[PDB]
Design a binder for this molecule. Sequence first.
Ligand SMILES: Cc1cc2nc3c(=O)[nH]c(=O)nc-3n(C[C@H](O)[C@H](O)[C@H](O)COP(=O)(O)OP(=O)(O)OC[C@H]3O[C@@H](n4cnc5c(N)ncnc54)[C@H](O)[C@@H]3O)c2cc1C
Ligand SMILES: CC(C)(O)Cc1ccc(-c2ccc(C(=O)N3CC[C@@H](N)C3)cc2-c2ccc(C#N)c(F)c2)c(F)c1
Lengths: 662, 132
Amino acid sequence: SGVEGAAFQSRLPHDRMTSQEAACFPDIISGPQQTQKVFLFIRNRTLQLWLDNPKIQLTFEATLQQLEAPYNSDTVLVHRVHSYLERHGLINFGIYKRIKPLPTKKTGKVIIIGSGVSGLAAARQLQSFGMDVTLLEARDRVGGRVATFRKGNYVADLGAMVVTGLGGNPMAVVSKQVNMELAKIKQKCPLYEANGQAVPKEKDEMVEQEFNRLLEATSYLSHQLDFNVLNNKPVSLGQALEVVIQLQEKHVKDEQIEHWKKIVKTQEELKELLNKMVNLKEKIKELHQQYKEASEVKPPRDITAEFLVKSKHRDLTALCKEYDELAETQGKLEEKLQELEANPPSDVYLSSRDRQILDWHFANLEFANATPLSTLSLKHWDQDDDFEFTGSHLTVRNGYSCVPVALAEGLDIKLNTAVRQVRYTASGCEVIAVNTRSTSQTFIYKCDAVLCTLPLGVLKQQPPAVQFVPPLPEWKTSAVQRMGFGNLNKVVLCFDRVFWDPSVNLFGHVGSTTASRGELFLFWNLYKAPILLALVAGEAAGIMENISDDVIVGRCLAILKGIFGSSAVPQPKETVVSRWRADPWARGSYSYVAAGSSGNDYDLMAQPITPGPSIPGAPQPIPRLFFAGEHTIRNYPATVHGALLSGLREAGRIADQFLGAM
Amino acid sequence: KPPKGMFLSQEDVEAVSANATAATTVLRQLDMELVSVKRQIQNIKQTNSALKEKLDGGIEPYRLPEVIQKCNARWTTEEQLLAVQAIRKYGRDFQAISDVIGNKSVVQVKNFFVNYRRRFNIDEVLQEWEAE
Ligand SMILES: Cc1cc2nc3c(=O)[nH]c(=O)nc-3n(C[C@H](O)[C@H](O)[C@H](O)COP(=O)(O)OP(=O)(O)OC[C@H]3O[C@@H](n4cnc5c(N)ncnc54)[C@H](O)[C@@H]3O)c2cc1C
Ligand SMILES: CC(C)(O)Cc1ccc(-c2ccc(C(=O)N3CC[C@@H](N)C3)cc2-c2ccc(C#N)c(F)c2)c(F)c1
């Protein structure tokens, strides 16, 4: 297909028109299928071109020069296609050489709040579109949650270090434009219990299988058995796990109960028998005497007492037939009681040494979702799973900040400018920021449109860091109450001495409690230099924000002493510590689908706001206030790509309102 | 539907999820019903173990050494008379009667019942077997 591989790489279906090309080719899609199949070629081709080299702008001339007829022919609709694609950031996004330099015919002022990837993406896009864009960032640097550390030759991302596959990832393109060295990450995760001695295969493997078995179990529990509201509260993922597990701890029991209750059916049968057998042995001891007695009466004899011997001799051989059957039929029953008493139903559901390792498999989950499983929606936590990329997960070896920074080249970024208030009305918008260094220094920005990349964390802040004037409508705010802003944090351990196993990327440590599963549950090297990251997840990470720096680097070194020995692990040349929920330009790490949220909230979060009319009776205005970043994009939350996609998007949306025609 | 080795009915589910406690009721009481059986097992293991002490002996001391008496159709007044008496202790049971006499086949014993039946009022020999 190859041209269809560009559709895939552009997250579009090569064989059908999207609900959204339909948007603005409602002619083509209303009409005949030849026209559609051509449309699609042009679309996919035009993409393939951009992709096949994305470090230079692809003009309309360029796309036509490169189309052979019969597609070469409809010169107007090739323009139509190239323009849709150009706007909506499918081509000519990120970082390119511009064949056509920036016309200084600038057209509309947009204030964008925040130099996060969401922001910078829309910013560059809007400026590519010819538009006055200015960016207002509270921080002293760009990138936000794309945050990289650097002291000397040490370098390490303190947020956002993975590329969750290149297969239809926009960042694929970006990473070509910025030449970031990405490196794969090797499968192998050695778990080390509280002592310091590895878990073996056998066990390790056993529990993964169980973990996975257990999750699938929740999914059934949800979709099929329909366990989606225990007592007018939505159901946590964690809740369903506790239930699933519990039913596995039931059963295991009833299994035993049915086995021993199978033994008694036996033991008690063999008793009903041992009685028939003892009482026969009585009728026999006795009847025998009588036949000794009557046989004693020596002959000649009359026939009544010949008959007495004769008859008693039959009757005694009857009973010994009988009793002998009963002692075949006895070992038949002491047979059954070897079989049963020998191999029994299983003792336990989970060892406390296992339920402990299982806790680490959950901590890993709490990490990637950046929240306690207590909080994830059961119906919806995995809703982003249909859209996961192809390709191996990779890590940014050279520090992910290179990307934000790249994006920021050639943009008006006011740093240390902390928006305090956003006012928006029919006629335009006023943004009131302050200088972060002196809070007293007050700034006012007037514009046609505000784009808000303020983090969900921040949006949730009470009382509010930023004030909307007029306030955001109940529906939007409600969405914010609902969604989940989560948390994780990181310890960055810089050494001189590569003491872990070089061929090993990452290795767990198993916490002694459930409550403590998050604490330094994983360690990661991925950097040229001798750096290990210590990751903190779950209910844990929330608390470890309080514990002092030295204290955390304590337990860091402790569990490295365990895993590797006091001989081997130096003190560290340099240390650093996430602590994201406390950072006030973040209030956490990333979104999640809290129980009681759905993916719809992510769409509500994207929906722009349109003010009331200036003079009552006036015509319905246009929308003034827009929203981007990772909390807006239901198909790619909590990612860099998702952010960048949200930005690409709002830019297109904004252009269509303020420049409509291309 | 659920993955292999995982157990879940709206029955078993709805019951670990009523009363906010009735999970640790159900799981942590079945093993009370389990201990109650593990003891009934023990009762019978002793109760039976006792009866197995009463059979040490077998019935070896009491086995009459059953020799084969080479069959016959010479129906002696000797055997004839045993037969009537056997009819009276037994009836129907052609086998026992032949087991007693020491030479018939339930053949030859089925043969007297009917054949010799004329002469030994075997009406009144089986009419006493319907009463004692
Ligand atoms: C620890 C961690 C690890 C992560 N790991 C990954 C990963 O491995 N892979 C992945 O794909 N994604 C990851 N993410 C997610 C990804 O980094 C973010 O989703 C992305 O940077 C979001 O960009 P954004 O533009 O939505 O918000 P942000 O990048 O936070 O930027 C928003 C900007 O708004 C600014 N701001 C906030 N308040 C104000 C104010 N009041 N006035 C003015 N400016 C303000 C902020 O300072 C910031 O610069 C991770 C996030 C975290 C926290
Ligand atoms: C699985 C293992 C060994 O524990 C290491 C590993 C690898 C990838 C991820 C991962 C997977 C999917 C995703 C990811 O795409 N999602 C789905 C959306 C959101 N729910 C997260 C993110 C990560 C990831 C998240 C946070 C950090 C940090 N810091 C990181 F480095 C990688 C992970 F969480 C952990």
